[PDB]
Structure 1
Amino acid sequence: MIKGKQGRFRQNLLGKRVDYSGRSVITVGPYLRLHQCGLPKKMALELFKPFIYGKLELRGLATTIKAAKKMVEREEAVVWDILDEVIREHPVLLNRAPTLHRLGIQAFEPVLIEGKAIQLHPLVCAAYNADFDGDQMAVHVPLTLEAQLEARALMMSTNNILSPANGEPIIVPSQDVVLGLYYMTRDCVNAKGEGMVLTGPKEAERLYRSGLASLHARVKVRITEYEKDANGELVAKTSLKDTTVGRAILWMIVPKGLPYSIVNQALGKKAISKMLNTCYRILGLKPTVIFADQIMYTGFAYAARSGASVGIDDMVIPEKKHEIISEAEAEVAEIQEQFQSGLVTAGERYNKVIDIWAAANDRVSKAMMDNLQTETVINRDGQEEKQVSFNSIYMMADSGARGSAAQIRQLAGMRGLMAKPDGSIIETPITANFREGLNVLQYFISTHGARKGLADTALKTANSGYLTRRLVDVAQDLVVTEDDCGTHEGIMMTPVIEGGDVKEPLRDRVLGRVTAEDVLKPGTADILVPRNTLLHEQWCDLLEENSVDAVKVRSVVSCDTDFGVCAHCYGRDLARGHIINKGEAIGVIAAQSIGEPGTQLTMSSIQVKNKGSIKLSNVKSVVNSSGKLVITSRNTELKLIDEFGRTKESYKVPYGAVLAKGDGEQVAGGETVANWDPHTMPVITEVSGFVRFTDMIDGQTITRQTDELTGLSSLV
């Protein structure tokens, strides 16, 4: 009774089924708002039977419950009024089957829609990562008013705009509306509405809709901004700005607080993402919601206006592809003949062949990208000018709506080199391109690769699910229970350099976290910030411009909370602005966030670039015979103290490396000081003197091996 699957724990405390629940395939209905959702009328009818019965007996249309059931199943006239009344304020939960991250369940306000499919808001689909392939989402209904409060207050889209994994808005527009917005803030040199002046955006829209002017053209227009530099006070200024017609038209949708420089760019997916980020970070939540709604609507409308299309002619194959392929064929034939001549080996032959093929492919990529990006060459109102191209494919790629450089490379040019099921890269690349036909063999090999990818995706899905299960079940217990452990002890956080470019800055790693020790600027004897205060974006930027390099910050591991964690040890609750609140557990969300991308995962010498002074760590060196500096410490690392003073570059120095300079000295940007011989372990000597055979027995311990090249042998 207690053990096994039939055991009561595993029998009835597990994924169950739920009444007052529904499911169907989903659609868009963009005219809806993110604070609201669609729901087919029939689903509303069956879902809320007791509710409708209660309102019915309240109105006394049929006193007994059986008669009310008969009325509703008959679908009589008055029932729809009752349905609207109950749906007046009664949010519901929408859900997807693979519930990876917590936005996969979400609260929304239904609206009664005809048909047989659920209209779902566009942007939230990206949070649901649910394409409209036919995904069947489910629906649940809270019962108690407390549950309604929870949903409307916690699971509400308005309350769920940023990711828990990190602070980026999860409501970033995905693929289509971004094309429209990119179409807005892009200039054609000469068209209608080029070369005049406007008093405001309103007449800009008027002239655009008139067709008297183009959607975009460099034009000075007076615009006004409302800045909050003061202590939470608006200051309204105005001035002329050069801009595209579409850009000025877009300016209206911006709320008062934001400036204009933010919109004065090409508005890529990252650019618009930081636009939302600024809007939330400065103007809070509701203005962001309204701004995003209007962004959706206007961008859809003007993408429809765009007539953004795609055609065979819209893809261009540079003629140099023929020439480049001819050169590559000649080169590979030459190298194969050289192998036949015996100069080189089969392995070396193959390696050089693949190298030259890759180089030719890179040449083709550069040629086609040049052919694509600036193809628009036209009169300027004068003779001729070349601008960024208005071909649909480059607009798509550069806008970041979908795809990347690699896919457009596949579309226009050769699709590179395919590997085999063994994983070894194949000697013969895919000489052809998709726009032209692909031979039997190239398609066959590409199918090997694609099927390998598909099976790997399935296996990765299963493994990610299992690993996520492990991560959640290990971390089910942990919860926030105390505000502050009152601990002075925390971790140290610094930027990260693997031995090249800095990969993650200090601003990102430190944001939203309460410092453990105060910040000591190098105006030393300066308490730059207090000792136990949260670090949000303004403070982080203060630190960044102050050039703070290493900061001691509070961490959960250092928390001294008995049976829980201290809030100050945890810092900001991402997906929310304020510091984390009491009681709110974090282990489950942490595990779930780290596990969500489990599907998205995969299954000599140095030339210093920057200019700065030389610093060394784990330093133990000596001047060699030649006068250069060699290092007598294996764990030595070189830092390039920048002009400001921070370590912008860090590289691991092997033993006995060759240094043209030394510590505490200046090195020009782009000067080779870091160099060495990675092979062979040196026996460099600390001191100088006669080298006697102290404990060297010849013929028993060592052997005299003679070199056949020079004559000067060496004891072995």
Structure 2
Amino acid sequence: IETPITANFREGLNVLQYFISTHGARKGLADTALKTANSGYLTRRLVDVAQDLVVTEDDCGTHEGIMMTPVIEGGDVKEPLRDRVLGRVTAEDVLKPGTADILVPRNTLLHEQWCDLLEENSVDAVKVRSVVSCDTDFGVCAHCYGRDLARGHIINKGEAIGVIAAQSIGEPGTQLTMSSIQVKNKGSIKLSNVKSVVNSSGKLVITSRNTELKLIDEFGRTKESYKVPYGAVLAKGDGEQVAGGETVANWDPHTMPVITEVSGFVRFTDMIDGQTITRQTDELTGL
């Protein structure tokens, strides 16, 4: 509706300001009554899938699983490394950016003291033992599951972890029905899986889809991450250290360009009018 409710509950609403407010007070009240059925069916379905999953071993002796990484995409840090990795078990012998410092006998419980040891150094990528990669037939082992969260140690044997999983995903289910790339902070510019070409001005332009912007500070970890398309225009280059407050990448949100790596002349060939092309000029410019 075009006008707001300019009154509050201390001055009291109007009659038309009150009839408007009961549009959205029943729209949310009929939502709460009609979505506890949609979440009680999802929790019943999740119990069945994870019915007979019981920790039935101690160490299955398997190799690596999921590599962990921050969730820094789009904007700022939302999960740091101390939130995703605390409680897991390291899969392979991990070391520091200053190399040859093994912290593990290939599998330890990574508790709060080892988390502060990862806080100190510039390490921001670990490989942990996941549960999908567990090699036990008919169950998992206590090392591929990691810490029992409700107690605070390594999990025991015979603990029904599949019912704990379903009741932890289905419990908040009744609660939650409802251009330009600017660098913000002093960090380096590194492009990975890169393909590029030095453009017509003295900058760099990107000519591959699988390249993304990485922001490395003075220590060695990545803090910010941006996506840049094929044929965009970058205002700076690679391998540099540029501070924040600069719209470093730019492209047209309409145009998807076809930019060329090769420096050479271009002639008309194999495009005959009436067969593959048409003749359309811009009568305002002429070019």
Identity over aligned pairs, percent: 100
Give the drift of 1:626.
1.8
How many Å separate the matches in 1 of 2:237 and 2:103?
33
Give the drift of 1:635.
2.2
How many Å separate the matches in 1 of 2:21 and 2:192?
49
How many Å separate the matches in 2 of 1:688 and 1:546?
45
- Pick closer, same or farther for the CA change 1:653–1:530 going to 2, 3 Å: farther
How many Å separate the matches in 2 of 1:433 and 1:656?
52
Q: Which has the higher contact order (CA 8 A, sep 6+)?
A: 2
Q: Which residue of 2 aligns with 1:431?
A: 6
How many Å separate the matches in 2 of 1:619 and 1:547?
23
Say which of 79, 85, 106 aligns to 1:510.
85
Structure 1, unmatched stretches of 5+, are 1-425
Give the drift of 1:667.
1.1
Q: Cα deviations across residues 484-534 of structure 1 (Å, max 9, x unaligned)?
A: 110122110011022111111111100111110122111111113332000
- Pick closer, same or farther for the CA change 1:551–1:680 going to 2, 3 Å: same
Equivalent residues of 1:616, 1:663 under 8 A apart: yes
- Pick closer, same or farther for the CA change 1:696–1:630 going to 2, 3 Å: same
Give the drift of 1:576.
0.7
How many Å separate the matches in 2 of 1:668 and 1:603?
39
Q: Cα deviations across residues 122-179 of structure 1 (Å, max 9, x unaligned)?
A: xxxxxxxxxxxxxxxxxxxxxxxxxxxxxxxxxxxxxxxxxxxxxxxxxxxxxxxxxx
Q: Cα deviations across residues 402-427 of structure 1 (Å, max 9, x unaligned)?
A: xxxxxxxxxxxxxxxxxxxxxxxx22
Secondary structure of the residue aligned to 2:45 is: helix
- Pick closer, same or farther for the CA change 1:525–1:483 going to 2, 3 Å: same
How many Å separate the matches in 2 of 1:698 and 1:513?
65
Q: Cα deviations across residues 295-316 of structure 1 (Å, max 9, x unaligned)?
A: xxxxxxxxxxxxxxxxxxxxxx
Q: Cα deviations across residues 29-50 of structure 1 (Å, max 9, x unaligned)?
A: xxxxxxxxxxxxxxxxxxxxxx
Whether 1:589 and 2:164 are equivalent positions in the alignment is yes
Say which of 12, 25, 41 aligns to 1:450.
25
Whether 1:621 and 2:191 are equivalent positions in the alignment is no
Equivalent residues of 1:608, 1:674 under 8 A apart: no
Q: Cα deviations across residues 239-279 of structure 1 (Å, max 9, x unaligned)?
A: xxxxxxxxxxxxxxxxxxxxxxxxxxxxxxxxxxxxxxxxx
How many Å separate the matches in 2 of 1:482 and 1:695?
69
How many Å separate the matches in 1 of 2:148 and 2:75?
32
Secondary structure of the residue aligned to 1:563 is: coil
Equivalent residues of 2:234, 2:250 under 8 A apart: yes
Secondary structure of the residue aligned to 1:635 is: coil
Q: Cα deviations across residues 558-597 of structure 1 (Å, max 9, x unaligned)?
A: 1000111011000001101220001111011101101100
Equivalent residues of 2:65, 2:91 under 8 A apart: yes
Give the drift of 1:662.
1.6
Whether 1:653 and 2:228 are equivalent positions in the alignment is yes
Give the drift of 1:710.
2.1
Give the drift of 1:618.
2.5
Equivalent residues of 2:52, 2:162 under 8 A apart: yes
Give the drift of 1:682.
0.5
How many Å separate the matches in 2 of 1:639 and 1:614?
6
Secondary structure of the residue aligned to 1:448 is: helix
Q: Which residue of 2 aligns with 1:608?
A: 183
Secondary structure of the residue aligned to 1:672 is: strand
Say which of 653, 674, 677 aligns to 2:252.
677
Q: Cα deviations across residues 211-264 of structure 1 (Å, max 9, x unaligned)?
A: xxxxxxxxxxxxxxxxxxxxxxxxxxxxxxxxxxxxxxxxxxxxxxxxxxxxxx
Q: Is the radius of gyration larger for structure 1 or structure 2?
A: 1
**Matching of residues 495-644 of structure 1 within 5 Å:** 495-602=70-177, 604-644=179-219
Q: Cα deviations across residues 183-215 of structure 1 (Å, max 9, x unaligned)?
A: xxxxxxxxxxxxxxxxxxxxxxxxxxxxxxxxx
Give the drift of 1:447.
1.1
Q: Cα deviations across residues 321-361 of structure 1 (Å, max 9, x unaligned)?
A: xxxxxxxxxxxxxxxxxxxxxxxxxxxxxxxxxxxxxxxxx
Give the drift of 1:700.
1.9
Secondary structure of the residue aligned to 1:674 is: strand
Equivalent residues of 1:519, 1:530 under 8 A apart: no
Give the drift of 1:536.
0.8
Give the drift of 1:456.
1.0
How many Å separate the matches in 1 of 2:106 and 2:253?
45
How many Å separate the matches in 2 of 1:677 and 1:450?
42
Q: Which residue of 2 aligns with 1:666?
A: 241
How many Å separate the matches in 2 of 1:676 and 1:562?
52
How many Å separate the matches in 1 of 2:104 and 2:5?
58
Alignment TM-score, normalising by the size of structure 2:
0.96
Equivalent residues of 2:204, 2:235 under 8 A apart: yes
How many Å separate the matches in 1 of 2:20 and 2:94?
58
Secondary structure of the residue aligned to 2:190 is: strand
Secondary structure of the residue aligned to 1:669 is: coil
Equivalent residues of 2:231, 2:258 under 8 A apart: no
Equivalent residues of 1:478, 1:585 under 8 A apart: yes
Number of residue pairs aligned between Structure 1 and Structure 2: 287
How many Å separate the matches in 2 of 1:694 and 1:710?
24
How many Å separate the matches in 2 of 1:427 and 1:560?
61
- Pick closer, same or farther for the CA change 1:478–1:469 going to 2, 3 Å: same
Secondary structure of the residue aligned to 2:159 is: coil
Give the drift of 1:603.
5.2
Equivalent residues of 2:73, 2:224 under 8 A apart: no
Give the drift of 1:477.
1.4
How many Å separate the matches in 1 of 2:7 and 2:249?
43
Give the drift of 1:664.
1.2
Most deviating of 685-694 and 642-651: 685-694
How many Å separate the matches in 2 of 1:577 and 1:470?
28
Q: Cα deviations across residues 656-682 of structure 1 (Å, max 9, x unaligned)?
A: 222122221111122221222222111
Say which of 55, 60, 63 aligns to 1:488.
63
Give the drift of 1:636.
1.2
How many Å separate the matches in 1 of 2:224 and 2:29?
40
How many Å separate the matches in 2 of 1:498 and 1:441?
45
Structure with the largest fraction of helix:
1
Secondary structure of the residue aligned to 1:575 is: coil
Equivalent residues of 2:59, 2:141 under 8 A apart: yes
How many Å separate the matches in 2 of 1:517 and 1:428?
61
Secondary structure of the residue aligned to 2:118 is: helix
How many Å separate the matches in 1 of 2:160 and 2:194?
46
Give the drift of 1:608.
1.0
CA RMSD for the aligned pairs?
Answer: 1.5
Give the drift of 1:694.
2.0
Secondary structure of the residue aligned to 1:527 is: coil
How many Å separate the matches in 1 of 2:158 and 2:37?
33
Give the drift of 1:435.
2.0
Q: Cα deviations across residues 538-576 of structure 1 (Å, max 9, x unaligned)?
A: 111111122320000001111000111011000001101
Equivalent residues of 1:460, 1:603 under 8 A apart: no
Equivalent residues of 1:475, 1:591 under 8 A apart: yes
Secondary structure of the residue aligned to 1:496 is: coil
Q: Cα deviations across residues 590-613 of structure 1 (Å, max 9, x unaligned)?
A: 011011000111251121111111
TM superposition outliers: structure 1 runs of 4+ over 6 Å: none
Give the drift of 1:442.
2.1
Equivalent residues of 1:489, 1:554 under 8 A apart: yes
Secondary structure of the residue aligned to 2:47 is: helix
Alignment TM-score, normalising by the size of structure 1:
0.39
